Amino acid sequence: VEKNITVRASVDPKLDLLQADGTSLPDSIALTYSSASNNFEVYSLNTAIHTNDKSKGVVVKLSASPVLSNIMKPNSQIPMKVTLGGKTLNTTDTEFTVDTLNFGTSGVENVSSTQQLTIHADTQGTAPEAGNYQGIISLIMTQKT
Amino acid sequence: VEKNITVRASVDPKLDLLQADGTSLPDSIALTYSSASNNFEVYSLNTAIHTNDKSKGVVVKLSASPVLSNIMKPNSQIPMKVTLGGKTLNTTDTEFTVDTLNFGTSGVENVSSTQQLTIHADTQGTAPEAGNYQGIISLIMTQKT
Amino acid sequence: VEKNITVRASVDPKLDLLQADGTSLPDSIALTYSSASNNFEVYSLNTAIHTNDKSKGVVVKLSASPVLSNIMKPNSQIPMKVTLGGKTLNTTDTEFTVDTLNFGTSGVENVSSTQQLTIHADTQGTAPEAGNYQGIISLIMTQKT
Amino acid sequence: VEKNITVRASVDPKLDLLQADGTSLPDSIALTYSSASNNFEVYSLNTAIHTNDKSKGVVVKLSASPVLSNIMKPNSQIPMKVTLGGKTLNTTDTEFTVDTLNFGTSGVENVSSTQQLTIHADTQGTAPEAGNYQGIISLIMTQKT
Amino acid sequence: VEKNITVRASVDPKLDLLQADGTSLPDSIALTYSSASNNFEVYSLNTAIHTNDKSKGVVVKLSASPVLSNIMKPNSQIPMKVTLGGKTLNTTDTEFTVDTLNFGTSGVENVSSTQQLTIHADTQGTAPEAGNYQGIISLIMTQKT
Amino acid sequence: VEKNITVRASVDPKLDLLQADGTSLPDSIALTYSSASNNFEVYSLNTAIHTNDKSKGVVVKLSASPVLSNIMKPNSQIPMKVTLGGKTLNTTDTEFTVDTLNFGTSGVENVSSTQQLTIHADTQGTAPEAGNYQGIISLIMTQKT
Amino acid sequence: VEKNITVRASVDPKLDLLQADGTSLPDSIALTYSSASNNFEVYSLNTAIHTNDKSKGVVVKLSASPVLSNIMKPNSQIPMKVTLGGKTLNTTDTEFTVDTLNFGTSGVENVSSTQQLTIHADTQGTAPEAGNYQGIISLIMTQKT
């Protein structure tokens, strides 16, 4: 036949992280460099947590510390700082209490309040070497008793 | 030599289904799960039908009823409802009359009006089992007297 | 053992043609047919020339005239026109002068300016016969005094 | 009896290494050269460790030091550095602790967190001789008390 | 006389089974194990039935019940379930009606609709013993009145 | 003495024909039949010509006309058309000029450009009799003044 | 009595060297000549050592130095270099320590890690005389305290 389309999906019944407007988080992001400040800008995205039950809190962590490294020479790299809900995320987990998520206040049941997601490839005022840089962020989420 | 590139193309002289912006349909699509509603959201795409002759209509059908099934445990699957031009597609063909396609009204000869293509892997408010899913949509399209 | 991975690489110390984003050129491409115009669409890609020394120009040519031919019936075929940097390529080599390549202006040393690579399986307003088509393009590239 | 298809499979009941999307790791990979830097680009792939029991850690090592060597003249070769989970692999085994793997946090039982697998044919800024290169990587994985 | 190449081909004038892209079916396939679920993943391939005359249906059967068996110890084996067009195949013949094959709708005369061919080495949630496994599938297909 | 391995090799110091990836040409090939068109599909392989001295051209010819004949009944056979570098080969030799071979442009000295080798068992739109077919192609190559 | 089949097998209870996929090593191999480089290409095969008891090391040696000699004229020959596990083999025994073989890490008890077997008919950049060459390699293996 003509126009064969393959459909894929990843399902996590307990938790999901979607944008405040209902769309899924972008699969990739692009940072903007500013030679005047010799540092990257802060990337901010509005996200809302979707949960199976509203009686349990959420715990968020990263699988590994994200690093933005040049593709041609990995020796040059810029650590990236990721913060969710105003608190910095790390390889050690952090807990988001149920009372601070405000489940259902947006008008949709089991949908959390808008959480500010921030990515910052912060250099210490030192210009990285010219080239193309790439990295990956692995945001983990789990319910807590 | 260096930089050998192989070119491939599938030609159907009578009929083609492309996006309203002139680009081809995506080869793959991704559905986003929502733990709050325990269901997938509707995926929508704008498409335009290209025809060899504008005086003869189009009939559309699916080769088989698509189902979104887990790659590891096919026992769990989510049937997908496909609709084109506002009418649900089924294994039994449906006819799009010529006067409802508006060939040429977009400014380009033999190009139909924008048709809404919708894929919805709807569960009956039942959470599918955790994992990643995969499926295929086979959209057949033929001209009709 | 388990998970044996074979690594392969082709090395040309003098020249390399890569995408503007740093990744390698695609090994395969697909063309989009449109029955309304009975012709293929133009495929365009951004590429950047890498050179061992920035003081020497580059020459580009095709090993043989690329032709898009049907796999079932090679009698039906569509000649393809390849153009790089805005100038049409042919089996007779064409010269890219050094001052027109802008080596180093992108911020990375010995990297040329973005060159527009275009492939067009241009039919003379004639619908090719239905079936699957396949062809290969061989892009030769050499330094010139 | 027409259409005879032979099926093969290798089973390791205790451990498996698969891509984050659930598919198996590629059997072969290709590296891209860049004469501007006279070095290869870093190849990165997302992988997830599968385990029979979540209470036991994982240990990773290489059977032999992988080396990318020319097929025509093995005297020319490029040592390759393999790193999994952010820590460099070596013929002397390295230990991945259980709490650093996050078994089950992805939503699928007994599936580890995404581990970044990186292959880099790091030349010391020295152009290898022209030709075709080939190498093999043997990634060992074992459960550790 | 140098470069002697031997050519072979099997001809069935009445029926053939080819991939949707026009190439022949793969001779060998590899299944991927996942110790997390202690089961094999489903392997799916798109195929199109080629027929001499479009007025006759197609019947599909297996010569013998395919079984995936360990090469070293045949006592350990995993039965494989084969389904084509959404209906499971068996040693007893199954009929595909002509109206269900859609001969010619793809744009090529006498070429049927894409049929989903699926192979699943379904264990009953029990881990097979370590080793290399191999099996064979003999897909018999014939025309029917 | 255990593990006795016999090694064989054919040496042609003046000319060799190898694949573009550096490996030798396949010893055996298989053609795929298509009952819809009642003809064999075109088999294409990329090859590169190796020479002792780049200053001399290459001449290519076939020892005898290749014919694809049924093993059980030679009376039924299919002539095969072989083309290298875009020009059909024949029992009468054909000349490939030195300037058309582009020796060394691939980055390896004394290695020619990629030459398209194509084999087509072109039936005249007539289905061959059912059975197994076999044939041999003897590609002769020589240097010419 | 029709269809008489003779079965032969060589049994070495203490050691066996087989391919990584479980099958036996090839009985004969073919090398590829390249007149451009006037040297043979390196032949690489994946092999795994089998042992009766995993607590003992393995020793590898050759009965006699392999030489690739022309069948018609023995005066013209090419010495062959054989390396197993990354260390070149010679007429004098070599040591493979138990800790280096990694018995059982592949998931099958008493099966060693994949050892790279390399055969190279290394000419000193001198073209051998035209003709057919044949040679034999006798790989001896023993267990050592």
Side-chain angles (χ1 to χ4, degrees), chain C residues 73-99:
Chain C
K73 288 197 295 293
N75 304 337
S76 177
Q77 65 189 354
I78 306 103
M80 292 188 298
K81 314 142 171 53
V82 184
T83 80
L84 180 74
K87 56 170 61 61
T88 303
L89 301 184
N90 290 318
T91 313
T92 56
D93 66 56
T94 68
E95 201 206 0
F96 291 76
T97 300
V98 66
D99 53 88

mmCIF file of all heavy atoms in Angstrom, chain C residues 73-99:
data_model
loop_
_atom_site.group_PDB
_atom_site.id
_atom_site.type_symbol
_atom_site.label_atom_id
_atom_site.label_comp_id
_atom_site.label_asym_id
_atom_site.label_seq_id
_atom_site.Cartn_x
_atom_site.Cartn_y
_atom_site.Cartn_z
ATOM 1 N N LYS C 73 11.919 -2.161 -14.101
ATOM 2 C CA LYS C 73 12.076 -1.905 -15.533
ATOM 3 C C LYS C 73 13.059 -0.761 -15.723
ATOM 4 O O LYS C 73 12.663 0.413 -15.785
ATOM 5 C CB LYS C 73 10.732 -1.586 -16.186
ATOM 6 C CG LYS C 73 9.821 -2.796 -16.321
ATOM 7 C CD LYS C 73 8.693 -2.558 -17.313
ATOM 8 C CE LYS C 73 7.755 -1.465 -16.837
ATOM 9 N NZ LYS C 73 7.009 -1.885 -15.618
ATOM 10 N N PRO C 74 14.358 -1.058 -15.829
ATOM 11 C CA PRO C 74 15.348 0.023 -15.973
ATOM 12 C C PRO C 74 15.160 0.869 -17.221
ATOM 13 O O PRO C 74 15.826 1.907 -17.344
ATOM 14 C CB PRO C 74 16.688 -0.725 -16.000
ATOM 15 C CG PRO C 74 16.344 -2.111 -16.416
ATOM 16 C CD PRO C 74 14.997 -2.385 -15.833
ATOM 17 N N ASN C 75 14.290 0.467 -18.150
ATOM 18 C CA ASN C 75 14.031 1.283 -19.329
ATOM 19 C C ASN C 75 13.405 2.625 -18.970
ATOM 20 O O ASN C 75 13.631 3.608 -19.685
ATOM 21 C CB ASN C 75 13.118 0.530 -20.296
ATOM 22 C CG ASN C 75 13.679 -0.819 -20.696
ATOM 23 O OD1 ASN C 75 14.889 -1.044 -20.631
ATOM 24 N ND2 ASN C 75 12.805 -1.726 -21.116
ATOM 25 N N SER C 76 12.631 2.688 -17.892
ATOM 26 C CA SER C 76 12.032 3.931 -17.419
ATOM 27 C C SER C 76 12.946 4.539 -16.362
ATOM 28 O O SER C 76 13.195 3.916 -15.325
ATOM 29 C CB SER C 76 10.638 3.682 -16.846
ATOM 30 O OG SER C 76 10.082 4.874 -16.324
ATOM 31 N N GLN C 77 13.437 5.746 -16.626
ATOM 32 C CA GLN C 77 14.385 6.384 -15.721
ATOM 33 C C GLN C 77 14.249 7.893 -15.834
ATOM 34 O O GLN C 77 13.776 8.420 -16.845
ATOM 35 C CB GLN C 77 15.820 5.944 -16.026
ATOM 36 C CG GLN C 77 16.328 6.381 -17.388
ATOM 37 C CD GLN C 77 17.657 5.745 -17.744
ATOM 38 O OE1 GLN C 77 18.264 5.051 -16.930
ATOM 39 N NE2 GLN C 77 18.118 5.984 -18.967
ATOM 40 N N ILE C 78 14.674 8.579 -14.778
ATOM 41 C CA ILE C 78 14.597 10.035 -14.692
ATOM 42 C C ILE C 78 15.986 10.592 -14.399
ATOM 43 O O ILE C 78 16.511 10.381 -13.297
ATOM 44 C CB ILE C 78 13.598 10.473 -13.608
ATOM 45 C CG1 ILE C 78 12.236 9.811 -13.842
ATOM 46 C CG2 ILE C 78 13.458 11.987 -13.592
ATOM 47 C CD1 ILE C 78 11.962 8.649 -12.917
ATOM 48 N N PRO C 79 16.623 11.298 -15.335
ATOM 49 C CA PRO C 79 17.919 11.909 -15.026
ATOM 50 C C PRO C 79 17.807 12.885 -13.864
ATOM 51 O O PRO C 79 16.816 13.604 -13.725
ATOM 52 C CB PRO C 79 18.296 12.620 -16.329
ATOM 53 C CG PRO C 79 17.541 11.897 -17.388
ATOM 54 C CD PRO C 79 16.248 11.491 -16.746
ATOM 55 N N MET C 80 18.843 12.908 -13.028
ATOM 56 C CA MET C 80 18.886 13.759 -11.849
ATOM 57 C C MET C 80 19.972 14.813 -12.017
ATOM 58 O O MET C 80 21.088 14.498 -12.449
ATOM 59 C CB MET C 80 19.151 12.931 -10.590
ATOM 60 C CG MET C 80 18.013 11.998 -10.213
ATOM 61 S SD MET C 80 18.258 11.204 -8.614
ATOM 62 C CE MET C 80 19.757 10.275 -8.923
ATOM 63 N N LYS C 81 19.645 16.057 -11.676
ATOM 64 C CA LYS C 81 20.580 17.172 -11.762
ATOM 65 C C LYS C 81 21.065 17.519 -10.360
ATOM 66 O O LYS C 81 20.253 17.771 -9.463
ATOM 67 C CB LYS C 81 19.925 18.386 -12.421
ATOM 68 C CG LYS C 81 19.133 18.073 -13.685
ATOM 69 C CD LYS C 81 17.875 18.916 -13.780
ATOM 70 C CE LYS C 81 17.204 18.763 -15.134
ATOM 71 N NZ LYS C 81 16.965 17.335 -15.481
ATOM 72 N N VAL C 82 22.382 17.535 -10.177
ATOM 73 C CA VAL C 82 23.009 17.814 -8.891
ATOM 74 C C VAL C 82 23.727 19.151 -8.991
ATOM 75 O O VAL C 82 24.487 19.387 -9.938
ATOM 76 C CB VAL C 82 23.988 16.696 -8.485
ATOM 77 C CG1 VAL C 82 24.555 16.967 -7.102
ATOM 78 C CG2 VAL C 82 23.296 15.343 -8.527
ATOM 79 N N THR C 83 23.481 20.027 -8.019
ATOM 80 C CA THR C 83 24.121 21.333 -7.955
ATOM 81 C C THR C 83 24.647 21.563 -6.547
ATOM 82 O O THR C 83 23.941 21.321 -5.565
ATOM 83 C CB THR C 83 23.149 22.456 -8.340
ATOM 84 O OG1 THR C 83 22.313 22.779 -7.220
ATOM 85 C CG2 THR C 83 22.270 22.028 -9.506
ATOM 86 N N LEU C 84 25.889 22.033 -6.454
ATOM 87 C CA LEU C 84 26.528 22.325 -5.178
ATOM 88 C C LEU C 84 27.059 23.748 -5.208
ATOM 89 O O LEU C 84 27.739 24.142 -6.164
ATOM 90 C CB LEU C 84 27.668 21.341 -4.890
ATOM 91 C CG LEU C 84 28.426 21.544 -3.575
ATOM 92 C CD1 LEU C 84 27.584 21.091 -2.394
ATOM 93 C CD2 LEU C 84 29.749 20.802 -3.601
ATOM 94 N N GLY C 85 26.752 24.516 -4.167
ATOM 95 C CA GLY C 85 27.215 25.890 -4.095
ATOM 96 C C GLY C 85 26.559 26.811 -5.098
ATOM 97 O O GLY C 85 27.105 27.873 -5.407
ATOM 98 N N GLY C 86 25.392 26.430 -5.617
ATOM 99 C CA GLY C 86 24.679 27.238 -6.580
ATOM 100 C C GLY C 86 25.064 27.014 -8.025
ATOM 101 O O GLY C 86 24.434 27.603 -8.913
ATOM 102 N N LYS C 87 26.069 26.185 -8.297
ATOM 103 C CA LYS C 87 26.502 25.888 -9.655
ATOM 104 C C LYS C 87 26.300 24.407 -9.951
ATOM 105 O O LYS C 87 26.633 23.547 -9.129
ATOM 106 C CB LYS C 87 27.970 26.275 -9.862
ATOM 107 C CG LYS C 87 28.943 25.631 -8.886
ATOM 108 C CD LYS C 87 30.394 25.857 -9.299
ATOM 109 C CE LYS C 87 30.758 27.336 -9.344
ATOM 110 N NZ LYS C 87 30.615 27.992 -8.017
ATOM 111 N N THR C 88 25.746 24.121 -11.126
ATOM 112 C CA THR C 88 25.405 22.751 -11.485
ATOM 113 C C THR C 88 26.666 21.905 -11.636
ATOM 114 O O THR C 88 27.660 22.349 -12.218
ATOM 115 C CB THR C 88 24.604 22.730 -12.787
ATOM 116 O OG1 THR C 88 23.428 23.539 -12.639
ATOM 117 C CG2 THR C 88 24.193 21.309 -13.144
ATOM 118 N N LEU C 89 26.616 20.686 -11.110
ATOM 119 C CA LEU C 89 27.724 19.753 -11.239
ATOM 120 C C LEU C 89 27.533 18.861 -12.458
ATOM 121 O O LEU C 89 26.409 18.604 -12.899
ATOM 122 C CB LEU C 89 27.850 18.892 -9.982
ATOM 123 C CG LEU C 89 28.071 19.639 -8.666
ATOM 124 C CD1 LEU C 89 28.286 18.652 -7.533
ATOM 125 C CD2 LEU C 89 29.245 20.598 -8.766
ATOM 126 N N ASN C 90 28.651 18.383 -12.998
ATOM 127 C CA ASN C 90 28.642 17.531 -14.179
ATOM 128 C C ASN C 90 29.850 16.610 -14.126
ATOM 129 O O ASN C 90 30.750 16.778 -13.299
ATOM 130 C CB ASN C 90 28.654 18.356 -15.471
ATOM 131 C CG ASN C 90 27.354 19.095 -15.709
ATOM 132 O OD1 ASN C 90 26.271 18.552 -15.495
ATOM 133 N ND2 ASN C 90 27.454 20.341 -16.156
ATOM 134 N N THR C 91 29.859 15.625 -15.026
ATOM 135 C CA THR C 91 31.011 14.735 -15.131
ATOM 136 C C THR C 91 32.289 15.500 -15.441
ATOM 137 O O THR C 91 33.380 15.012 -15.128
ATOM 138 C CB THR C 91 30.763 13.676 -16.205
ATOM 139 O OG1 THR C 91 29.463 13.105 -16.024
ATOM 140 C CG2 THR C 91 31.811 12.577 -16.123
ATOM 141 N N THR C 92 32.179 16.680 -16.045
ATOM 142 C CA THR C 92 33.305 17.585 -16.234
ATOM 143 C C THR C 92 33.426 18.459 -14.993
ATOM 144 O O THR C 92 32.455 19.105 -14.586
ATOM 145 C CB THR C 92 33.116 18.451 -17.481
ATOM 146 O OG1 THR C 92 31.876 19.164 -17.390
ATOM 147 C CG2 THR C 92 33.107 17.586 -18.733
ATOM 148 N N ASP C 93 34.615 18.479 -14.401
ATOM 149 C CA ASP C 93 34.787 19.072 -13.087
ATOM 150 C C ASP C 93 34.566 20.584 -13.131
ATOM 151 O O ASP C 93 34.811 21.257 -14.135
ATOM 152 C CB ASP C 93 36.176 18.743 -12.537
ATOM 153 C CG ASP C 93 37.295 19.379 -13.340
ATOM 154 O OD1 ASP C 93 37.294 20.616 -13.507
ATOM 155 O OD2 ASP C 93 38.184 18.634 -13.803
ATOM 156 N N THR C 94 34.089 21.115 -12.005
ATOM 157 C CA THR C 94 33.899 22.544 -11.808
ATOM 158 C C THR C 94 34.720 22.985 -10.605
ATOM 159 O O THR C 94 34.841 22.254 -9.618
ATOM 160 C CB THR C 94 32.422 22.902 -11.588
ATOM 161 O OG1 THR C 94 31.981 22.381 -10.328
ATOM 162 C CG2 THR C 94 31.558 22.325 -12.700
ATOM 163 N N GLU C 95 35.272 24.191 -10.688
ATOM 164 C CA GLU C 95 36.225 24.689 -9.705
ATOM 165 C C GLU C 95 35.541 25.660 -8.754
ATOM 166 O O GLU C 95 34.791 26.539 -9.188
ATOM 167 C CB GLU C 95 37.406 25.378 -10.393
ATOM 168 C CG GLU C 95 38.655 25.466 -9.530
ATOM 169 C CD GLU C 95 39.561 26.618 -9.915
ATOM 170 O OE1 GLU C 95 39.225 27.356 -10.864
ATOM 171 O OE2 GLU C 95 40.615 26.787 -9.263
ATOM 172 N N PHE C 96 35.806 25.496 -7.460
ATOM 173 C CA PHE C 96 35.367 26.426 -6.423
ATOM 174 C C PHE C 96 36.604 27.178 -5.943
ATOM 175 O O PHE C 96 37.466 26.606 -5.270
ATOM 176 C CB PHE C 96 34.678 25.693 -5.275
ATOM 177 C CG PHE C 96 33.350 25.094 -5.643
ATOM 178 C CD1 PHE C 96 33.281 23.937 -6.397
ATOM 179 C CD2 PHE C 96 32.173 25.690 -5.230
ATOM 180 C CE1 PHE C 96 32.061 23.386 -6.733
ATOM 181 C CE2 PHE C 96 30.950 25.143 -5.566
ATOM 182 C CZ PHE C 96 30.894 23.990 -6.319
ATOM 183 N N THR C 97 36.688 28.460 -6.288
ATOM 184 C CA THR C 97 37.858 29.250 -5.934
ATOM 185 C C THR C 97 37.924 29.440 -4.421
ATOM 186 O O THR C 97 36.904 29.401 -3.728
ATOM 187 C CB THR C 97 37.816 30.602 -6.644
ATOM 188 O OG1 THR C 97 37.801 30.395 -8.061
ATOM 189 C CG2 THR C 97 39.041 31.434 -6.290
ATOM 190 N N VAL C 98 39.142 29.644 -3.911
ATOM 191 C CA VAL C 98 39.349 29.684 -2.465
ATOM 192 C C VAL C 98 38.589 30.845 -1.836
ATOM 193 O O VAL C 98 37.979 30.700 -0.767
ATOM 194 C CB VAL C 98 40.854 29.757 -2.142
ATOM 195 C CG1 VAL C 98 41.447 31.076 -2.621
ATOM 196 C CG2 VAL C 98 41.085 29.572 -0.648
ATOM 197 N N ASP C 99 38.613 32.017 -2.474
ATOM 198 C CA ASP C 99 37.967 33.183 -1.882
ATOM 199 C C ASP C 99 36.453 33.035 -1.814
ATOM 200 O O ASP C 99 35.806 33.769 -1.059
ATOM 201 C CB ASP C 99 38.328 34.456 -2.653
ATOM 202 C CG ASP C 99 38.061 34.339 -4.140
ATOM 203 O OD1 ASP C 99 36.924 34.636 -4.566
ATOM 204 O OD2 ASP C 99 38.994 33.984 -4.886
#
